[model samples]
Every structure is written in C-alpha cells, then in structure tokens.
Target: KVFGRCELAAAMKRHGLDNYRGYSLGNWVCAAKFESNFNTQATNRNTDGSTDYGILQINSRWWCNDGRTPGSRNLCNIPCSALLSSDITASVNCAKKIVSDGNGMNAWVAWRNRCKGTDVQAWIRGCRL
Candidate 1:
C-alpha cells in the first residue's frame, strides 16, 4: 500500500493483465474504493452474524460450501481473495467460471453492470498504489 504512484502502477500491471484480459485496473480499483474504501479485507454483514469478505467483499459463508455436502463444495470452496491476490483477468475469469459453471459471462453480469463509469485517474490518485 505504501508503494505510491510507481508501485501503484506496478500493482495495476500485475492485477488484470493475463488470461483474464479486458479489465481496467484503475477502474476496478476505483470501484473497489467506492465499494469498500480499498480495504482488501472488506466484507458485508448479514445482520444475523453471517458475512462476506475481501476486496470484493464476498460473503464467504454463502460462497463457500460445508465441504461435507456432495455438489455443495466445488466453486464456493476456493478463497474469495483469489480476486485480491491474483491477476485481475484470471480472478474475474474465475469469477465467470464460478457463476457460469462453464456457461460464460452470464454469471458475472451483475459485476459488469455495477463496475462501470469509474473515473480512472481518481482511483489512480486516491490509492496511489
């Protein structure tokens, strides 16, 4: 987080550039800022104590299976922070997989709908890598 502009740029470089192309690092980070102030460990509450986690603020509880169920464990079992630590494209690509079950972008349509219109430079400056 203390890398400043250069490190920020580097973070951007590694974030979305890979098999998971078509992402804008600046825009995505900006969206993350809007969603959770860039807290990579962010999550939302269920009011009943259940919660999501990570920069995407995933509800790992719901997203994950008990690992004891038959067909209840595969997709949701992976770490939600996969989006935070890996290449952006791969992360989102995995997102699509999680949603699609191999069907395609239909699973991530909500993300596509929500992640638009971010001012690139604002995120670039605000997080500053």
Candidate 2:
C-alpha cells in the first residue's frame, strides 16, 4: 500500500520512530518520502547487484538477505521479501536496527541530502503526532 503523508507519519510513530535514535519523527517521514515515497512495494536495484527494499528502502547488501547479494550480512535476519509487505512492521524494525547501529538517519543518502539539517517539519506539518 502507498501511504499518505500523515498516514505514514502515524505509522512511523506507531512503530516508535518518534524521537528514535535522537532523530525526530519528521526526519523519518522525510526520509521515507524520498526513499520510496511511502510505497511498501518499492524496490531499487543497486549498481552492486543488491537491492533496496520497502518504504525506507532498506538495502539488501548489509541489512536483509535477498539470496542474490553476494555478501549479504542479513543483519536484520529476514528475507528481503519481508520488507515489501504492506504491514511495514518488519520494515520499521529493520530501520530501527540500522539507526541503532550508529548509522543514524544518514544511512539513507536521500535523508542526508534532503532531510538532514533541513526544515523537516513540513513533512509532518498536518500530522497529529
């Protein structure tokens, strides 16, 4: 399912992304907006033969196992297919693990280039967080 802006914000907050890892809910909302436009089935194949999956576009190389990424660490310990589910619980959980590993929101280039240090409030402006 493709989530609306406020819907995505609420979902992220429900998953405990608000103020998670010192990053505000707006940060996550903005990141996901740019990463996959809040589309749960989004996928981007990398130049390295790995793929990014789900709303946050979690990468297959280091996060999830796709069975095709040559050296996948599978740190999230889940199949990449799980990330594409509309549930988003697995996606959010994996995203938290990524941030918890000290990568911060910058792990996503979209977040660093667009959401980082910017007026992210607009991303959640109408959301009742």
lDDT by residue for model 2 (4-110), tens:
99999998999999999889999999999999988999999999999999999999989999899996789999999999998989999999999999778879999
- RMSD of model 1 against the true structure: 5.9
lDDT (tens digit, per residue) of candidate 1 on 1-129: 222344444554564422233545564454445554555445565555544444444444445432332333335456555545433333344443453455332233334555455355554564434
Q: Evaluated with lDDT, which candidate comes out highest?
A: 2
TM-score of 2: 0.97
Q: How does candidate 2 score on lDDT? A: 0.93
lDDT of each: 0.45, 0.93
Task: Tell me the spans in candidate 2 whose CA falls farther than 4 Å from its real position.
Answer: none
| TM-scores for all predictions | 0.48, 0.97
- Listed per model in order, the count of residue pairs whose N, CA or C atoms clash below 3 Å is 6, 0
Model 1 gets an lDDT of 0.45
